């Protein structure tokens, strides 16, 4: 519960550049982004100091935490299978893959493996509908996967 943004901070320091003159709000977005890399499941303590780098009151940063879907509150399977449940993808019949997948994966759609390599998300639109099913694995991307194929895809990281 003691996050440090120092060593990679110089990289972080550039983030400081992006706006002109007054304010560091622009940094805000950048900052949190830097953080998720630093630890995932980032924690309030990390925020506050980030605010110092930010130079803004906590709630102000706190208002920011609410809004952006991206930042993650606790911890996720390092594998974080974002599974899109939105219409289009639904139109893909995708939904069955997730259900079949959940059985394969082992936790209610809501949970993550006690192994903790993964952390499923019901996700809404991944902004790749032509490609449905689309699976975003960690930083990376997986496109239209067969149930057997989906299992195989889960497999390799699983190794």
- CA 142 distance to own-chain centroid: 15
Contacts of 66 (CB under 8 A, 6+ apart): none
Q: Hey, what are 150's tokens?
A: 């989906």
According to CB under 6 A, which residues from 6 to 65 bind ligand FES?
A: none
Q: Hey, what are 50's tokens?
A: 């980030």
Tell me how far, at minimum, the Cβ of 64 lies from another protein, in Å: 7
Tell me how far, at minimum, the Cβ of 28 lies from another protein, in Å: 5
Q: Which is nearer to ligand FES, 15 or 92 (CB)?
A: 92
Where would I find the beta strands (DSSP E) of 25-131?
81-84, 121-123
CA dist 49 and 74 (Å) reads: 18
According to CB under 6 A, which residues from 80 to 99 bind ligand FES?
A: 84, 86-89
Instruction: Kindly indicate which of the ranges 17-25, 63-71, 108-116, 120-128 contains the residues binding ligand FES, using the contact rule CB under 6 A.
Output: 120-128
Give which of 5, 8, 4, 26 is closest to 17, Cα–Cα. Answer: 26
CA angle in degrees (0–180, nearest 5) for 149-81-79 = 100
Position 128 contacts ligand FES (CB under 6 A): yes
Position 125 contacts ligand FES (CB under 6 A): yes
Q: Which is nearer to another protein, 45 or 124 (CB)?
A: 124
According to CB under 8 A, which residues from 70 to 109 bind another protein?
A: 70-71, 82, 86-88, 90-91
Q: Hey, what are 44's tokens?
A: 């309030």
Position 121 contacts ligand FES (CB under 6 A): no
User: Which residues contribute to the site for another protein (CB under 8 A)?
Assistant: 18-20, 23, 25-26, 28-30, 33, 60, 63-64, 66-71, 82, 86-88, 90-91, 124-132, 136, 139-141
């Amino acid at each position: 519960x003691x996050x440090x943004x120092x060593x990679x901070x110089x990289x972080x320091x550039x983030x400081x550049x992006x706006x002109x003159x007054x304010x560091x709000x622009x940094x805000x977005x950048x900052x949190x982004x830097x953080x998720x890399x630093x630890x995932x499941x980032x924690x309030x303590x990390x925020x506050x100091x980030x605010x110092x780098x930010x130079x803004x009151x906590x709630x102000x940063x706190x208002x920011x935490x609410x809004x952006x879907x991206x930042x993650x509150x606790x911890x996720x399977x390092x594998x974080x299978x974002x599974x899109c449940x939105x219409x289009x993808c639904x139109x893909x019949x995708x939904x069955x893959x997730x259900x079949x997948x959940x059985x394969x994966x082992x936790x209610x759609x809501x949970x993550x493996x006690x192994x903790x390599x993964x952390x499923x998300x019901x996700x809404x639109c991944x902004x790749x509908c032509x490609x449905x099913x689309x699976x975003x694995x960690x930083x990376x991307x997986x496109x239209x996967x067969x149930x057997x194929x989906x299992x195989x895809x889960x497999x390799x990281x699983x190794x």
